[PDB]
Amino acid sequence: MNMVMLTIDGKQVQVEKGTTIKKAAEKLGIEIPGLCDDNDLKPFGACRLCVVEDARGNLVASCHTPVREGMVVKTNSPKVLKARRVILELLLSSHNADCFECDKNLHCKLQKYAYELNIRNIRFKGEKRNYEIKDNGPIYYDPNKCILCGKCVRICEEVQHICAIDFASRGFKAYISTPFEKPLLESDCIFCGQCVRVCPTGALAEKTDIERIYEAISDPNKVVVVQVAPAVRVALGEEFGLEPGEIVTGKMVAALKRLGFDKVFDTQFAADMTIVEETAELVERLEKGENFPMFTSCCPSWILAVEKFYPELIPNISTARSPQQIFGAIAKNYYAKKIGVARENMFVVSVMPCIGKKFEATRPEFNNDVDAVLTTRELARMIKESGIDFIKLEEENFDSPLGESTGAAAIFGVTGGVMEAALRTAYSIMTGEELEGDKIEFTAVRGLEGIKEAEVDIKGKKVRIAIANGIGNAKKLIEKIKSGETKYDFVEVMACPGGCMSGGGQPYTDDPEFRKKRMEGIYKNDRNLPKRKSHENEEVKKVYEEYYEKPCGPKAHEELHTHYHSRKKEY
Amino acid sequence: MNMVMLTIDGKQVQVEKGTTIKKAAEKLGIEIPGLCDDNDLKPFGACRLCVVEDARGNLVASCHTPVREGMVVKTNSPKVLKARRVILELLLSSHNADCFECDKNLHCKLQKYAYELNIRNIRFKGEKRNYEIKDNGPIYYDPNKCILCGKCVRICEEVQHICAIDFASRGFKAYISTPFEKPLLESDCIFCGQCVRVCPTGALAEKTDIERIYEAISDPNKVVVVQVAPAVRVALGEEFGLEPGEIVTGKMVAALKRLGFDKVFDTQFAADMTIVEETAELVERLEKGENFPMFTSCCPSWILAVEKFYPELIPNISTARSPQQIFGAIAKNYYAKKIGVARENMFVVSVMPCIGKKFEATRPEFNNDVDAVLTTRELARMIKESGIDFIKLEEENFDSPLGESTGAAAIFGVTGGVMEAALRTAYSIMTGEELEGDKIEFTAVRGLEGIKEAEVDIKGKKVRIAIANGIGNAKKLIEKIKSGETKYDFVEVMACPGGCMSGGGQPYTDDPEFRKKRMEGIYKNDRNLPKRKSHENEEVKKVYEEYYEKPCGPKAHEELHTHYHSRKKEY
Ligand code: SF4
Ligand code: SF4
Ligand code: SF4
Ligand code: SF4
Ligand code: SF4
Ligand code: SF4
Ligand code: SF4
Ligand code: SF4
Ligand code: FES
Ligand code: FES
């Protein structure tokens, strides 16, 4: 091993060779500001705001200069501060200053740096950016506030391997867009929502359906039922000053009950129903031994990717609905006749951490089962708007008769958790017995690796299980499968890297290790529940024996399944 | 005690009769927004943003509504939210939106309420407020961001009884002004800074001089000494997310060392200098028995209030300088000859929590001993500017030979702690012995009462002592003295209510009970020290025996004394 000695602010530093000055100065109790840098991306050097001076007398960037042995650098010299002040004055000279009306208010990094570097009087006044905004679906793009940091194109090209947007024009009028300024829906985008999560300004944000929620609640002839996702309860607490990984289920239930919503349920019931349907389909397919491999259809971004780029995989993907639409069908068809409320007077609201769900809700194939879709940020805005203090609430429980949950549906917010639930139910449906002890947990499908392969043995029969997180890794698996190197049986894809815990709806964070904390939170949540199996739930059995009488029945085929059509129109 | 039964948002409430419907709902884990209300002021009802809905169906204000038996109210009805949204749109329609240049950025309450209530598109665009910025000294007034809440007028009317500013004009063009738009120096202001502390916008701020500090640092031939106030050690941590009242001495010393300052010192040394000099003066005045009562000179605002309103008490004021100017004279007179530097080439910077110090630094009669002054908020902004992480610093001590101190000089940030620091020294100098055990602490001069009185018996000799915090209580006690009811010996006055811990330079807080926490922090800091007596300090005695040889000497009269001249201009 090779170690490197250097001096920073007159202090001796030992660092491993090859790390940058920004990374090497983390343990020294100092932080260099920068806008174009992220922990998941390569250095770009477009902000030029992270400059520090070496011994010679010139300023160099600190995010892409490797540490060489025997240099002295300074961080609080007056020249560096002057350069940073002038650079932020230049940035702020052409920014439309409607900070009252910005969705990214109180979380914008540019605003924090404008406060932090003591800017009080901008001498450069003149031409401002003046473009026209247009709708794009669930993604609201305002090119008046862009600073051309390049994070969105880098996260859409280097990680996602999709290349949906890129730079355009030259000079002062350069701007990031699609080909020929077309809307994102008919472009090559798949609505993963990663570009929204990394934008340091308010250029990229979410279309809001807040007014429709308030008009629906204000109407005295409409009954409102609201569902929450499994992955919201672990990261909702970041807005209110708590560390990530805290379980706030009861507090959020109390907040939802006090917000005016008539009924509060959870997706975990529909999640268990989806698991039952998927494992029935898997058992049937394995008995016939046809259409290998079989893909899961629980991620709207994945199904958009299949419909847009790979139309040949349409026969091989499952026909099961998303859990959101499953709960919508249950609420509009079975619960409504039980309570005695007309279908035209029922409102269903969902809280999900994804952005693909916002587009998925308005697909004409689903007959408008879900009316409006929220995100975690919108729910956190409701709580502050209504004045509810989140810290000192009293925890309550979910309503009846479909609020009770199991431990199999509590790990959908982690990559491969659907696979653990599928193996948990498949072991019981094949072997006939129930796993007890450490055999309940499948540790072979846990972690944060890009590709997760497993050879699962059930009563002497071995099956192949493949998990891919990230669209690029899914493309790699597609290339390997079409190459015919090996054959799998049951393959999961989630477009967001790391699972739904890192979707576009989750609150913004600065810690570089939020994924590990959220995984620990979800797993500790799952370990704190008496029931760990999907089929052991009673209410799912009551719903089946009350209305459908059989999984994968003709009524279930009518309501619990859908068909996909290829969107890859030829040129 | 008579209790009242009611319901608020469907929850039963038990509260005493007489509380409003906003202050009696804070203990239900719910809080309704408001801008015109503060815990130290009578309700005024100018925001009209704290409205709720009663049973009848008309919107009623909450900050001035007494509660009676039998009301049902709701604070989350759609009508109330719509009214609040429209009212905030009306406010932000006429606000100059340069939130990058605003000194109150990331702490403005209007910004936070614009974020909370989900404002996205201002429909009412029209004529804005267009006034002209004028200079006033240490108070920077910008009547373009004023929302006419009236907090400054009420706090200069109800508490201070100074009557410096008042409303002017009518209609849309009304504003806050002095008579005839004269500068605040020539008006009846006394520069207490309370109006700065309560302003919920960026209208009233500080004239910030970080720039001059920066070319002072960048000059290679100038040597910089920075001094810190006793009341800063208990309030800086609130700027970094800590609980108020945490002792952060070592952390702020490390931060000041890393900021480029050549030498760092505490002003407790000069404070003990002032204590021993004032004790000598008090012993002298007791021996002659003339010019009673005698007033302290530790507060510049008190001196201004005397020079403007009560010019007949000038012969009765102590001639001792403030500790800041005494430390400046020591640094520019004794320390400079010891190190071997020219007097013009020494730069003295102070970090004090008061606002009147900014004006006091530039008096022509002090011969420009100090060059620039700061407050705690600017110190925190500099710390965050250089990138220093305050949480993970290492404790380090002061410099030499003016770094160490005693416990008598650490309680200046409390109403009463100055005379409590002088009674021990007077006891020691007149009796000849030193207090032991719990007799060091005097429990009769601690608390938060408006006027504190005590009769202290020392060796059979009784002295009458009085404390007045707040200029209103000072005026009351001056009226009592001029009435001739009782005779005093030694009177302390601090202009800000609650002592120097509630100055204008301290960080903004929303907790209603910050004064108790700050007092507890100060007392814990005092009790965590080995030496508790000003006389037992070593370097004070060394300085006298090397340069003065006697307190109240001709050299001390030349350098540690000043004279006051009346400012009451005849009309
Ligand atoms: S949503 Fe995903 S695919 Fe679409 S532009 Fe953003 S990063 Fe690229
Ligand atoms: S759109 Fe957002 S992420 Fe992309 S360059 Fe502009 S500011 Fe950066
Ligand atoms: S992007 Fe940031 S600085 Fe720009 S308007 Fe929005 S909040 Fe203000
Ligand atoms: S992984 Fe989850 S958050 Fe990401 S696109 Fe798929 S469903 Fe949405
Ligand atoms: S007072 Fe508040 S809202 Fe107005 S410009 Fe300053 S920070 Fe923005
Ligand atoms: S500084 Fe004090 S006296 Fe002067 S206007 Fe403000 S509150 Fe009134
Ligand atoms: S100057 Fe500040 S405190 Fe005074 S009325 Fe205007 S906004 Fe209110
Ligand atoms: S009491 Fe302290 S903070 Fe207030 S004006 Fe006097 S010296 Fe300044
Ligand atoms: S973000 Fe580091 S050089 Fe631009
Ligand atoms: S601000 Fe409370 S009633 Fe006006």
Contacts of A98 in chain B (CB under 8 A): 97, 122
| Ligand 1 touching residue A153 (CB < 6 A) | no
Asked if residues B137 and B104 have their Cβ atoms less than 8 Å apart, the reply is no
Asked if the Cβ–Cβ distance from A120 to B389 is below 8 Å, we say no
B423 CB neighbour count, 10 Å cutoff? 21
Asked if the Cβ–Cβ distance from B30 to A111 is below 8 Å, we say no
- Name the maximum alpha-carbon separation found in chain B: 81
The CA A135 to ligand 5 mean position distance, Å, reads 29
Q: Where are the beta strands (DSSP E) in A218-351?
A: 223-228, 263-266, 294-295, 346-351
Is there a catalytic annotation at residue A278?
A: yes
| Closest by CA position to A237, among listed A398, A386, A39, A383 | A383
Minimum-distance CB partner of B115 among A106, A260, A388: A106
CA B37 to chain A, closest CA, distance in angstroms equals 16
Is there a catalytic annotation at residue A26?
A: no
The CA A471 to ligand 9 mean position distance, Å, reads 27
| Ligand 10 touching residue B37 (CB < 6 A) | yes
The CA B101 to ligand 10 mean position distance, Å, reads 28
The percent of chain B in helix, strand and coil, each rounded to the nearest 5, is 40, 15, 45
Is there a catalytic annotation at residue A318?
A: yes
| Closest by CA position to B286, among listed B467, B429, B421 | B429
Q: Is A192 annotated as a binding residue?
A: yes
Asked if residues B214 and B184 have their Cβ atoms less than 8 Å apart, the reply is no
Query: Alpha carbon B94 to chain centroid distance?
Result: 32
For ligand 4, pick from A189, A496, A515, A518 the residue to mutate: most ligand atoms within 8 Å of CB: A496
Minimum-distance CB partner of B118 among A95, A117, A385: A385
Asked if residues A465 and A419 have their Cβ atoms less than 8 Å apart, the reply is yes
What are the beta bridge partners of residue B335?
Answer: none
Enumerate long-range contacts of B539-542, CB under 8 Å, 24 or more apart.
B539/B269, B539/B401, B539/B402, B539/B404, B540/B269, B540/B272, B540/B273, B540/B276, B542/B401
Sign of the four-CA dihedral B514, B520, B524, B527: positive
d(C-alpha B178, C-alpha B189), whole Å: 9
d(C-alpha A188, C-alpha A180), whole Å: 13
d(C-alpha B148, C-alpha B173), whole Å: 10
Catalytic residue among A206, A239, A277, A281: A281
Contacts of A29 in chain B (CB under 8 A): 388-389, 392-393
The DSSP output letter for B332 is: I
Interstrand relation of B139-141 and B11-16 (parallel, antiparallel or unpaired): unpaired
| Closest by CA position to B145, among listed B182, B121, B170, B111 | B111
d(C-alpha A73, C-alpha B283), whole Å: 57
Residue B516, token pair as written in the block? 């108790």
End-to-end C-alpha distance for chain A, whole angstroms: 55
CA A400 to chain B, closest CA, distance in angstroms equals 21
Catalytic residue among B151, B238, B322, B500: B500
Pocket of ligand 6 (CB under 6 A): B 155-156, 160, 162, 164-165, 189-195
Asked if residues B40 and B159 have their Cβ atoms less than 8 Å apart, the reply is yes
Asked if the Cβ–Cβ distance from A122 to B105 is below 8 Å, we say no
Asked if residues B499 and B391 have their Cβ atoms less than 8 Å apart, the reply is no
End-to-end C-alpha distance for chain B, whole angstroms: 54
Contacts of A260 in chain B (CB under 8 A): 76
Tokens 């910077």 found at: B349
CA A421 to chain B, closest CA, distance in angstroms equals 39
Contacts of B105 in chain A (CB under 8 A): 111, 114-115
Sign of the four-CA dihedral B239, B245, B246, B247: positive
d(C-alpha B117, C-alpha B570), whole Å: 53
For ligand 10, pick from B48, B51, B87, B201 the residue to mutate: most ligand atoms within 8 Å of CB: B48
**Count of alpha carbons within 13 Å of B23, Cβ hemisphere only?**
17
Asked if residues A258 and B76 have their Cβ atoms less than 8 Å apart, the reply is yes
d(C-alpha A206, C-alpha A195), whole Å: 11
The percent of chain A in helix, strand and coil, each rounded to the nearest 5, is 35, 15, 50
* DSSP H/E element including A443: none
Torsion, Cα A295 A299 A303 A305, to 10 degrees, reads -110
d(C-alpha A508, C-alpha B140), whole Å: 35
Q: Is A22 annotated as a binding residue?
A: yes
Chain A contact probe: residue of B115, B243, B251, B252 with most A CBs at under 10 A: B115
Minimum-distance CB partner of A218 among B32, B78, B98: B78
Asked if residues B29 and A392 have their Cβ atoms less than 8 Å apart, the reply is yes
Q: Is B99 annotated as a binding residue?
A: yes
**Count of alpha carbons within 13 Å of B457, Cβ hemisphere only?**
2
Asked if the Cβ–Cβ distance from A97 to B99 is below 8 Å, we say yes
Determination approach: cryo-EM
Asked if residues A264 and A399 have their Cβ atoms less than 8 Å apart, the reply is yes
The residues, ordered by sequence, that sit 6+ positions from B418 with a Cβ below 8 Å of its Cβ are B296, B298, B411, B412, B492
Q: Where are the beta strands (DSSP E) in A128-183?
A: 139-141, 166-168, 175-177
What's phi and psi for A4, nearest 5 deg?
-130, 130
Asked if residues B398 and B381 have their Cβ atoms less than 8 Å apart, the reply is no
What are the beta bridge partners of residue A320?
Answer: A561
Asked if the Cβ–Cβ distance from A29 to B392 is below 8 Å, we say yes
What's phi and psi for B493, nearest 5 deg?
-135, 130
Pocket of ligand 5 (CB under 6 A): B 95, 98-99, 102, 104-105, 108, 110-111, 145, 201-202
Asked if residues A439 and A305 have their Cβ atoms less than 8 Å apart, the reply is no
For ligand 9, pick from A36, A148, A154 the residue to mutate: most ligand atoms within 8 Å of CB: A36
| Closest by CA position to B563, among listed B390, B255, B208, B320 | B320
Q: Which residue's alpha carbon is at the smallest distance from atom 7 of ligand 5?
A: B105
Q: Which residue's alpha carbon is at the smallest distance from atom 4 of ligand 7?
A: B152
What's phi and psi for B502, nearest 5 deg?
-110, 40
Q: Where are the beta strands (DSSP E) in A291-417?
A: 294-295, 346-351, 372-374
Asked if the Cβ–Cβ distance from B100 to A95 is below 8 Å, we say yes
| Closest by CA position to B10, among listed B75, B61, B65 | B75
Contacts of B99 in chain A (CB under 8 A): 97, 99-100, 111
Query: Alpha carbon B417 to chain centroid distance?
Result: 15
| Closest by CA position to B109, among listed B40, B169, B47 | B47
| Closest by CA position to B451, among listed B487, B413, B492 | B492
Q: Is B552 exposed, middle or buried (0-12, 13-18, 19+ CB in 10 A)?
A: middle
What are the beta bridge partners of residue B468?
Answer: B451, B493
d(C-alpha A481, C-alpha A562), whole Å: 25
d(C-alpha B262, C-alpha B155), whole Å: 40
| Ligand 1 touching residue A374 (CB < 6 A) | no
| Closest by CA position to B257, among listed B225, B230, B213 | B225
What are the beta bridge partners of residue A61?
Answer: A51
Residue A372 to residues A208, A215, A350, B121, B178, Cα–Cα distance (Å): 10, 12, 7, 21, 54
What are the beta bridge partners of residue A224?
Answer: A347
Helices and strands in chain B, H and E counts: 17, 17
Pinpoint the alpha helices (H) of B231-375. Answer: 249-258, 268-288, 300-309, 323-330, 336-339, 356-360
Sign of the four-CA dihedral A335, A340, A343, A348: negative
The residues, ordered by sequence, that sit 6+ positions from A436 with a Cβ below 8 Å of its Cβ are none
- Degrees, nearest 5: CA angle A81-A82-A85: 85
Contacts of B101 in chain A (CB under 8 A): 119-122
Ligand 1 atom index nearest CA of A152: 7
Asked if residues A547 and A416 have their Cβ atoms less than 8 Å apart, the reply is no
Residue B383, token pair as written in the block? 């710390």
d(C-alpha B374, C-alpha B376), whole Å: 7
Contacts of B98 in chain A (CB under 8 A): 97
The CA B194 to ligand 10 mean position distance, Å, reads 20
Tokens 């509504």 found at: B65
Asked if the Cβ–Cβ distance from A116 to B385 is below 8 Å, we say yes
| Closest by CA position to A304, among listed A25, A23, A568 | A568
Which residue of A lies nearest to B100 if distances are taken between CA atoms?
Answer: A114
Query: Alpha carbon A99 to chain centroid distance?
Result: 26
Size of interface A-B (CB pairs under 8 A): 118
A99 CB neighbour count, 10 Å cutoff? 23
DSSP class per residue in B266-285: ETHHHHHHHHHHHHHHHHHH
Conformational region of residue B498, where left means phi above 0, alpha means psi within -120 to 50, and beta covers everything else: left
Ligand 2 atom index nearest CA of A151: 3
Which residue of B lies nearest to A11 if distances are taken between CA atoms?
Answer: B258
Is there a catalytic annotation at residue B281?
A: yes
Is there a catalytic annotation at residue A365?
A: yes
Q: Which residue's alpha carbon is at the smallest distance from atom 4 of ligand 10?
A: B45
Ligand nearest to the CA of A110: 3
Catalytic residue among B298, B350, B378, B502: B298
The CA B195 to ligand 6 mean position distance, Å, reads 5
d(C-alpha B369, C-alpha A64), whole Å: 47
Ligand 3 atom index nearest CA of B99: 8
Helices and strands in chain A, H and E counts: 18, 17
